[PDB]
Amino acid sequence: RDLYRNTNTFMIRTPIFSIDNYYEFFRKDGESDKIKDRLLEICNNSVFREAILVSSKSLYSTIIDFCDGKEIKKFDYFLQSIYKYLIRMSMRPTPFGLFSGVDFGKYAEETVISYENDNFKKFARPDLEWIIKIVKELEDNHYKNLTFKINDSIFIKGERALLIHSTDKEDNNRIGEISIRATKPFMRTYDLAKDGIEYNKLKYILIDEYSIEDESKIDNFLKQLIEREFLISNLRPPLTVLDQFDYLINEVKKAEIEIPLVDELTEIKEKLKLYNETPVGAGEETYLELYKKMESVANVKNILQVDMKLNLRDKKINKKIISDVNDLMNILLDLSMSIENPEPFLSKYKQEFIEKYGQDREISLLEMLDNDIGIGPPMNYERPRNNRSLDVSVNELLDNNVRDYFMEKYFQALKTNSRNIAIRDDEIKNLELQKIDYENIPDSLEINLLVKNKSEDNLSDEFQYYIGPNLGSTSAGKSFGRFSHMMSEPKKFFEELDERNIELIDSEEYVTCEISYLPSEVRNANVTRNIHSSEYEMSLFTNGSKDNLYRIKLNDIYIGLENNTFYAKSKTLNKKLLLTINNMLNPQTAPNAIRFLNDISLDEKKLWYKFVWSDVYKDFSYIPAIKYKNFVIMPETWKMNKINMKINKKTEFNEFKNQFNDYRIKYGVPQYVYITFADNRILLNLDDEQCVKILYHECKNSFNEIILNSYEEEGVNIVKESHKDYICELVIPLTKIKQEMLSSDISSLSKERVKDPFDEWLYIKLYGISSNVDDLIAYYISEFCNELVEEEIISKYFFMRYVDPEQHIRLRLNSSQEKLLMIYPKIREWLSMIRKKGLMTYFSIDSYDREIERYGGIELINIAEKVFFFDSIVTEDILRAKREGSFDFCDEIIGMISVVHYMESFGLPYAKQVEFLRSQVSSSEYREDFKQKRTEYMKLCNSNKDWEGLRESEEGNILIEILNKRRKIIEYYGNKVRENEEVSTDLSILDSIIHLNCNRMFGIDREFEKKVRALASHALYALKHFK
């Protein structure tokens, strides 16, 4: 069955030259060989000259000098650069500058793609660095005329206010945190400028409210706030508008500042429009005039950004291509189930979150990621690193059968001298892998494909697909975002994507939100300009396109765990957020907050281009192509190391050449390969190409990503201009087909939650008790603590067993601070006496962190702490009686009786008990044979009358009399729990108290508790006859 459906359109990419210009230049279509001539015959090409001008001006000047016949200094670096750019313009589809272009097609019944006469329109727009330089200058000089607003990434921690990063730089290093003292005037400003305020309106209000008496004090205060970007002006353009330059012009006109600049900007706008009308190759003179004019306003390294559009005549493809992608995705998602732990760092972070905050709380995003007041970021995050000494070892737990399956394939391929590895559906089905759930399939994806017609002998749509080097993306619309200004109507595309995303999720609880942020290196933001159709927006360090009604803030997001998967929520909206980022920004370079928000949008979803074999074959220096029907998922790859290529940094050419031919003959490297960073396609039977390769190899440590890939050397291309072939790449966006108490307001350091030592609670941890726990609890703790309770020095106590690396006992005493400090001298004597007998080693006094939300809130936990007290008394009595020999029941029988007694007294009716115990899966089959003692269990676990089946003997009578001390308090607690209306699913509390009781009686043992629950469920199920 098909999992994915196509959208309304796709993208086409094609370089500016045909592949004929590549073979003609490397003396393939002509046998003549010569360094110059061809170099002069290309450097005088108009299209080549302009394409170089738009990208590298220095090389353009050097080309002009060379054409003038002047003395070129190097002439080696010159030749290498010219060769690399010519190869890129002929053979690399990826769009950049005037080297390559983009267009948008449609699906149909037949494939026809053709070129029009008027190709290659230009789309020139000012760079972001230029605009930001102008904006900063304006707001530095004319701040008095501007309107300012508060930054959305601000975080107030105690008496300091912080930002996640800074757009500026410290000397020559980035700024990872700026903190200022959050004084009273700062808070007043933080309230006034919440949604925008004029400079004078704020300044005079502050002067009125403080009287300062020195105006230069307020001016410096506000200027210091503005310089550090705590206040954002209205001149700064959004990244999610369709035109940043027009927005800036309108804003400066509104402010009425720097009149000379306003007319100059309009002149630049007018000139910039003319350049967009010239054909490619004819705009050299206009570009220079425009560049000279623009550089006079603000001189920066990057001034103009240029893109071009193919403008094809026909752009249809056969809709059969969507079936093949579905087959590929079926097999790729089937294999994904062989890896058990695909995200180890996030899986560890979930455990840290659960250990710290439990599962019934929602924690602020910025507090959670803080090193001091949180748990820090995951252990692989590079922006502020976790300063804790945790273990970073990780293991993805690949299945052994699949690992063996992929090694036989490699061995067979080597033995038979085959160049490819073919995987098949029937072979994968024999591995008996687990099935994937509809909840783990990603909602949308994109895939990059190079399509080549299999053969011209039949004139038929037999297509051969090669997955592109980048493999696509994890969401539909990420690749299309950058080109929003070139689409005919971009809104309809993103509106459809948003509608489909909403269709796939439960409504009335979710909203869509777009994350936009302006990095420190504003050069990286040129790819972040894009449109979106999400309902809300969060813009950091820039203005937003939305009204203040649809504005989100970083200090408003709250994180939680539901079904063991993270989610984000907005406190003000009370809606969960469905976060989107419609651009190819690399998360790993972003701050921790942005990177974390990106991660949890893919939480528990399989990543389709994380291949299983990548870990099996990582140690090999040769890997054959991996194929599936008519897909080449991976190309054939060779890589060089110090063993097979002994190259020194001082190695001379003509010795590398002779050493490299041995490599070619030994490993069978074909004639055409890709050098897979930036130099790409290379013809190895050409001296200049090997010169390129030695220059690249020597610099790149001789191992640093020197990976050769085979060329797509079968089939023919599908895009033709008259009779010239063009290399074409498709980007196919797909969407999934649809198949049918946390509101607590207690802060983390509230006096209700954390109790300091002797703050009404004395919390003691006893170490070194492993071998004598039962005797200690039964005889020593019991007597001393009960004597304290009777004397009225403490009101109650309870204990439990835990493990922080080492095993210990946690004992908590409740009384006033004065009494707790009064009896401590006697507690020391007691513990010294206990130690002298070898029953313990040492102890500590710790802070008590109460689990308010886990036990029903602030009003009900005070009763859970009495339930714990009576349960501790009962545990002591049972252990003492068991050691004295009063009864001889096994551990399992005691556990079962205790669980049944808890459920019966809490008020859970029999109709629910078997469902309740089965809810943890334990009751399925696991201990059906172990219940071979059916009769004894059925007699003991029946609670009819007054446990009549248990009171038949003195042992059972004693056991049931010990337990009844615990009944009235549990009944009271259950009544109060079910009386509350804010508390839902009281079955969560019952499970917690049962877990605690089992821990007290038997310690840390998961398997034993599972067994006890399973046996209890089976025993209760068999008694269905007696109700």
């Binding site: 800074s166 700026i178 903190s179 004084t183 403080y210 410096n220 205060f221 210091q224």
Partner: peptide
Amino acid sequence: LDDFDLDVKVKA
């Protein structure tokens, strides 16, 4: 310190 003093602290 006065209310208008912002003790700027920067990490780099």
